[PDB]
Design a binder for this molecule. Structure first.
Ligand SMILES: CCCC[C@H](CN(O)C=O)C(=O)N1CCC[C@H]1c1nc2ccccc2o1
Ligand SMILES: CCCC[C@H](CN(O)C=O)C(=O)N1CCC[C@H]1c1nc2ccccc2o1
Ligand SMILES: CCCC[C@H](CN(O)C=O)C(=O)N1CCC[C@H]1c1nc2ccccc2o1
Ligand code: NI
Length: 196
């Protein structure tokens, strides 16, 4: 199903998710497939390259993605990672570049700000079949991996902003009246907030 995406201020976005159950014998929850299907449907309707479970109000440690550019050729374009563990290269503390570092989030709809990210990242975890999966890349793909793991850890990309970028974002969030609970938008019902 296509379901609402929670907006900054919703507690489910701002606390760490609970890992997905994996039994001793390797088995995943039998009803996980339905949640995954909803995550794909919602990501797609929202014109996303990624979606974390807590963005749809589910505090479980998994994300889906569909993101082609800069991925290692060993990585599927579209997939899911259950219980992801994130590795990165050096996360830069220099001021992000407005012409290359812009980043947004469906839980902060209609906004984007230059955001510092590691150039390379890898996520390992399980796929929907419970088999180990490892995906990696640079540029956009690495940014996506960091962004989704961020959600699952209880963070938004807003939490990474610095200086003039953080200033610009703080005012924007305030002016929307965001940062309080209970706010959401519904892809396919509400207009696409990114002009997509
Ligand atoms: C946290 C979102 C709930 C995921 C759930 C997964 N699934 O297919 C069933 O397990 C789902 O899509 N559901 C659960 C009930 C029906 C559908 C659903 N939940 C909605 C919530 C709002 C709008 C439409 C909705 O459609
Ligand atoms: C770099 C990761 C951006 C993830 C974000 C979805 N999200 O919040 C997941 O957690 C997303 O797809 N966004 C946010 C802005 C619009 C859309 C988006 N960002 C893009 C970047 C390149 C190509 C298509 C893109 O579509
Ligand atoms: C340990 C929490 C995970 C359980 C459940 C997963 N689910 O329903 C989605 O499939 C969930 O997220 N729930 C169940 C009740 C409301 C929501 C939830 N759990 C939260 C935990 C913290 C903050 C907000 C939360 O919202
Ligand atoms: Ni996001």
């Amino acid at each position: 199903a296509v379901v609402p995406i929670r907006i900054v201020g919703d507690p489910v976005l701002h606390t760490a998710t609970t890992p997905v159950t994996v039994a001793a014998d390797g088995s995943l929850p039998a009803d996980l497939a339905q949640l995954i299907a909803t995550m794909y449907d919602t990501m797609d309707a929202a014109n996303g390259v990624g979606l974390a479970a807590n963005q749809i109000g589910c505090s479980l440690r998994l994300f889906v993605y569909d993101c082609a550019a800069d991925r290692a050729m060993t990585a599927r374009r579209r997939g899911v990672v259950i219980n992801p563990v994130l590795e990165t290269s050096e996360i830069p503390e220099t001021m992000p570049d407005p012409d290359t570092d812009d980043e947004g989030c469906l839980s902060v709809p209609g906004e984007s700000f230059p955001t510092g990210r590691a150039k390379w990242a890898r996520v390992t975890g399980l796929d929907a079949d419970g088999s180990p999966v490892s995906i990696e890349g640079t540029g956009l793909f690495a940014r996506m991996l960091q962004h989704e793991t961020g959600h699952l850890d209880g963070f938004l990309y807003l939490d990474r902003l610095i200086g003039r970028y953080a200033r610009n974002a703080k005012r924007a969030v305030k002016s929307h009246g965001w940062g309080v609970p209970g706010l959401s938008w519904l892809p396919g019902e509400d207009p696409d907030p990114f002009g997509h």
